[PDB]
Design a protein around this ligand. Structure first.
Ligand SMILES: *C/C=C(C)/C=C/C=C(C)/C=C/C1=C(C)CCCC1(C)C
Lengths: 133, 133
């Protein structure tokens, strides 16, 4: 069939490094690229094609209910099992991840027009700020 | 302000690598992940809270028509300008990318429920297979 419509997810990718050197891509960029997965969405109207390719490194979704404990496996992150519980502290959403790591969790809150996020592990805190699209 | 719904786009990241090292994420994954853009999607429905973090390297769109040559910019790819002609050899979508690289193009086709793609440049051939996610 010539119908190539659809969202496609890459399943196999060989000699991608050799092809990348043929285009003179620098070695640091080639290191990133070989670990990336690729999604390719084709929108086809006969001989008229439009397709988009996105290259991602690590996807990670989660779905929970506030105030209900849930088991969480952090695959593609650190690959640990934790017993997670998320509660509101006023306007701050607070998550504790009980497991091997001490002080493991995050805090997420709206301030003005922006989302702030603080990830914590042990004595390390990562602070992140997002703007809404 | 507990409504955190939205598509959120990172504007700053503090101590991300220290956080990952606290998690024992290997050095190579930390080096890649810190060079990437992170997009956070939040679907919030009452007490049900779903978030989905995507870490993307590069994104690329194109629309064209079989039989028509067209100026093309491999934006976010290798970032070259080419003259691309996409034709049908049987039920195979073949492309030749004219420009300052010898023997550049690709071929794409369907068999069953899988998309086969071959990227060519110089003497290098890259083969990829996609599953219809
Ligand atoms: C409220 C939002 C939260 C808790 C999201 C946090 C995001 C992370 C823990 C991100 C983790 C990483 C990636 C998805 C990419 C690769 C590196 C990781 C594992 C640190």
């Amino acid at each position: 069939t010539r119908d190539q419509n659809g969202t496609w997810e890459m399943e196999s990718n060989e000699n991608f490094e050799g092809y990348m050197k043929a285009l003179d891509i620098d070695f640091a960029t080639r290191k990133i690229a070989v670990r990336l997965t690729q999604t390719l969405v084709i929108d086809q109207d006969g001989d008229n094609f439009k397709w988009k390719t996105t290259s991602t490194f690590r996807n990670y979704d989660v779905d929970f209910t506030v105030g209900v404990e849930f088991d969480e496996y952090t695959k593609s992150l650190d690959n640990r099992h934790v017993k997670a519980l998320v509660t509101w502290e006023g306007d701050v959403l607070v998550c504790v991840q009980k497991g091997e790591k001490e002080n493991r969790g995050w805090k997420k809150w709206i301030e003005g027009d922006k989302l702030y996020l603080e990830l914590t592990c042990g004595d390390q805190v990562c602070r992140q700020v997002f703007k809404k699209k």
